[PDB]
Protein backbone atom coordinates (compact mmCIF):
# COMPACT_ATOMS: atom_id res chain seq x y z
CA UNK A 1 0.00 0.00 0.00
CA UNK A 2 1.04 3.55 -0.78
CA UNK A 3 -1.24 6.91 -1.36
CA UNK A 4 -1.80 6.02 -5.22
CA UNK A 5 -2.77 2.65 -4.28
CA UNK A 6 -4.81 4.57 -1.30
CA UNK A 7 -6.73 6.65 -3.51
CA UNK A 8 -7.02 4.84 -6.29
CA UNK A 9 -9.16 2.49 -4.24
CA UNK A 10 -11.04 5.69 -2.27
CA UNK A 11 -11.45 7.25 -5.49
CA UNK A 12 -11.83 4.53 -8.46
CA UNK A 13 -11.37 4.80 -11.91
CA UNK A 14 -14.16 6.21 -14.37
CA UNK A 15 -13.23 6.92 -18.16
CA UNK A 16 -16.05 9.49 -18.65
CA UNK A 17 -17.19 12.23 -16.98
CA UNK A 18 -18.93 11.63 -13.98
CA UNK A 19 -20.44 13.72 -10.76
CA UNK A 20 -18.43 13.25 -7.70
CA UNK A 21 -20.11 12.66 -4.03
CA UNK A 22 -21.21 16.32 -3.86
CA UNK A 23 -22.62 16.48 -7.48
CA UNK A 24 -19.39 18.11 -9.07
CA UNK A 25 -18.24 17.09 -12.63
CA UNK A 26 -14.92 14.98 -12.44
CA UNK A 27 -13.07 12.44 -14.29
CA UNK A 28 -10.34 9.67 -13.96
CA UNK A 29 -9.57 8.76 -10.46
CA UNK A 30 -11.73 12.13 -8.77
CA UNK A 31 -10.03 14.31 -10.84
CA UNK A 32 -12.59 17.21 -10.06
CA UNK A 33 -12.52 19.84 -13.31
CA UNK A 34 -15.64 22.46 -11.94
CA UNK A 35 -17.98 23.03 -9.77
CA UNK A 36 -20.18 24.46 -12.01
CA UNK A 37 -23.63 22.95 -13.27
CA UNK A 38 -22.73 23.22 -16.94
CA UNK A 39 -21.57 19.92 -18.79
CA UNK A 40 -20.52 21.98 -21.16
CA UNK A 41 -17.52 24.03 -18.51
CA UNK A 42 -16.64 20.69 -17.33
CA UNK A 43 -15.89 19.28 -20.79
CA UNK A 44 -13.78 22.62 -21.78
CA UNK A 45 -11.91 22.00 -18.57
CA UNK A 46 -10.98 17.63 -19.13
CA UNK A 47 -10.01 19.57 -22.71
CA UNK A 48 -7.63 22.01 -21.34
CA UNK A 49 -6.67 19.30 -18.39
CA UNK A 50 -5.92 16.84 -21.34
CA UNK A 51 -4.75 19.01 -24.06
CA UNK A 52 -6.98 17.89 -26.90
CA UNK A 53 -10.61 17.80 -27.80
CA UNK A 54 -12.35 14.76 -26.26
CA UNK A 55 -15.81 13.46 -26.34
CA UNK A 56 -15.85 13.77 -22.30
CA UNK A 57 -13.89 10.60 -22.31
CA UNK A 58 -10.22 9.67 -21.66
CA UNK A 59 -7.46 6.94 -21.64
CA UNK A 60 -6.40 4.65 -18.72
CA UNK A 61 -2.87 6.24 -19.17
CA UNK A 62 -4.45 10.08 -19.41
CA UNK A 63 -6.39 9.31 -16.54
CA UNK A 64 -3.21 8.38 -14.34
CA UNK A 65 -1.19 11.24 -15.82
CA UNK A 66 -4.03 13.45 -14.19
CA UNK A 67 -3.93 11.11 -10.67
CA UNK A 68 -0.08 12.11 -11.01
CA UNK A 69 -0.42 15.42 -11.20
CA UNK A 70 -3.25 16.06 -8.31
CA UNK A 71 -1.02 13.77 -5.42
CA UNK A 72 1.87 16.08 -6.48
CA UNK A 73 -0.45 19.12 -6.20
CA UNK A 74 -1.84 17.65 -2.99
CA UNK A 75 1.55 17.54 -1.62
CA UNK A 76 2.66 20.78 -2.73
CA UNK A 77 -0.49 22.53 -1.25
CA UNK A 78 0.92 20.43 1.74
CA UNK A 79 4.03 22.26 1.87
CA UNK A 80 3.25 25.80 0.78
CA UNK A 81 0.55 26.08 3.79
CA UNK A 82 1.81 27.38 7.16
CA UNK A 83 0.02 25.38 9.21
CA UNK A 84 -0.14 22.37 7.33
CA UNK A 85 3.16 21.58 6.51
CA UNK A 86 4.36 21.71 10.11
CA UNK A 87 1.93 19.03 10.89
CA UNK A 88 2.87 16.77 8.14
CA UNK A 89 6.39 17.03 8.44
CA UNK A 90 5.98 15.98 12.05
CA UNK A 91 3.77 12.73 11.07
CA UNK A 92 5.31 9.16 9.53
CA UNK A 93 4.92 8.00 6.20
CA UNK A 94 1.68 5.98 6.60
CA UNK A 95 -0.06 9.32 8.38
CA UNK A 96 1.49 11.35 5.72
CA UNK A 97 -0.34 9.37 2.87
CA UNK A 98 -3.70 9.85 5.37
CA UNK A 99 -2.82 13.59 5.16
CA UNK A 100 -2.45 13.85 1.61
CA UNK A 101 -5.73 11.98 1.26
CA UNK A 102 -7.63 14.62 2.62
CA UNK A 103 -6.17 17.14 0.89
CA UNK A 104 -6.64 15.52 -2.11
CA UNK A 105 -10.67 15.28 -1.04
CA UNK A 106 -11.11 18.78 0.42
CA UNK A 107 -8.10 20.71 -0.71
CA UNK A 108 -5.65 22.95 1.25
CA UNK A 109 -8.05 25.54 2.77
CA UNK A 110 -10.76 23.22 3.80
CA UNK A 111 -7.83 20.76 5.54
CA UNK A 112 -6.06 23.66 7.07
CA UNK A 113 -9.61 24.62 8.83
CA UNK A 114 -9.55 21.44 10.85
CA UNK A 115 -7.23 23.41 13.46
CA UNK A 116 -7.72 21.63 16.91
CA UNK A 117 -7.67 17.78 14.14
CA UNK A 118 -4.13 19.07 13.36
CA UNK A 119 -2.89 19.98 16.63
CA UNK A 120 -4.07 16.57 18.07
CA UNK A 121 -1.76 14.80 15.20
CA UNK A 122 1.03 17.07 15.95
CA UNK A 123 0.27 15.99 19.56
CA UNK A 124 0.75 12.39 18.54
CA UNK A 125 -2.97 11.87 20.55
CA UNK A 126 -4.37 9.60 18.09
CA UNK A 127 -7.36 8.62 19.41
CA UNK A 128 -8.12 12.31 20.36
CA UNK A 129 -7.84 13.28 16.68
CA UNK A 130 -9.70 10.55 15.45
CA UNK A 131 -12.86 11.47 17.57
CA UNK A 132 -12.17 15.00 16.85
CA UNK A 133 -11.54 14.56 13.16
CA UNK A 134 -15.05 12.82 13.29
CA UNK A 135 -16.89 15.55 14.29
CA UNK A 136 -17.24 17.19 10.57
CA UNK A 137 -19.25 17.33 7.92
CA UNK A 138 -16.37 15.38 5.70
CA UNK A 139 -17.21 12.60 8.43
CA UNK A 140 -21.04 12.80 7.96
CA UNK A 141 -21.19 13.05 4.13
CA UNK A 142 -18.37 10.48 3.38
CA UNK A 143 -18.52 7.94 6.52
CA UNK A 144 -17.27 4.95 4.82
CA UNK A 145 -14.01 7.05 3.18
CA UNK A 146 -13.81 9.28 6.19
CA UNK A 147 -13.31 6.55 8.56
CA UNK A 148 -10.81 4.22 6.39
CA UNK A 149 -8.72 7.91 6.70
CA UNK A 150 -9.18 7.87 10.45
CA UNK A 151 -8.18 4.50 10.77
CA UNK A 152 -5.51 5.36 9.22
CA UNK A 153 -4.69 8.56 11.53
CA UNK A 154 -4.94 6.41 14.32
CA UNK A 155 -3.20 3.50 14.02
CA UNK A 156 -0.22 4.58 11.08
CA UNK A 157 -1.43 1.12 9.48
CA UNK A 158 -2.76 0.13 6.29
CA UNK A 159 -5.28 -1.82 8.33
CA UNK A 160 -8.14 -0.30 6.75
CA UNK A 161 -6.82 -0.59 3.57
CA UNK A 162 -6.62 -4.17 3.56
CA UNK A 163 -8.90 -6.87 2.38
CA UNK A 164 -10.52 -4.03 0.04
Do not use: C
Amino acid sequence: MNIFEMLRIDEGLRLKIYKDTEGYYTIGIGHLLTKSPSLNAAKSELDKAIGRNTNGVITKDEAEKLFNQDVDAAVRGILRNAKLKPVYDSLDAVRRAAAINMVFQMGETGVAGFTNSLRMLQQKRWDEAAVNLAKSRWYNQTPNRAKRVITTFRTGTWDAYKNL
